[PDB]
Design a protein around this ligand. Sequence first.
Ligand SMILES: [Mg+2]
Length: 181
Amino acid sequence: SCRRAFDLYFVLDKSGSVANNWIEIYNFVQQLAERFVSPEMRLSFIVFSSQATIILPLTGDRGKISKGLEDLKRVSPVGETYIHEGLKLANEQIQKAGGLKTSSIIIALTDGKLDGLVPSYAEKEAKISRSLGASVYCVGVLDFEQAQLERIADSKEQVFPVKGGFQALKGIINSILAQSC
Ligand SMILES: [Mg+2]
């Protein structure tokens, strides 16, 4: 059935590889927040590099969202790319909000450039997200790793470039509206 309540978890790469494009990431997040202002649309901001942190715990309070955006605007990307840790912080909040009883969307902003065993960890954690009933989208930055993002997202139709033709914003907004009453 159609839904009105969505919880949107932004899982944002602040590793060194994306440092020169942090503005694109921030702008995407600000634009999607701007689009969805209802209190039944709750947002959470998570950042990750060599460790992950919840910048904005899940909330519909727009004052807190404004401050969360101020905090994201000052981020200084550096270090390694442990995307699995960012996904796990989204999963922990989803589990605490109700698990399969929730209406949960994860949007990962990343170049998908993963090292060593991180692909293994990331794919396992995204499979956990889906087991909790969440849907995973990936928005690719720079010369992003398309296949890696397709594996993390629910499918290739939930992967978009952050650059060009308003593809990512339109595609994700229209995907959410399709699920909406
Ligand atoms: Mg990186």
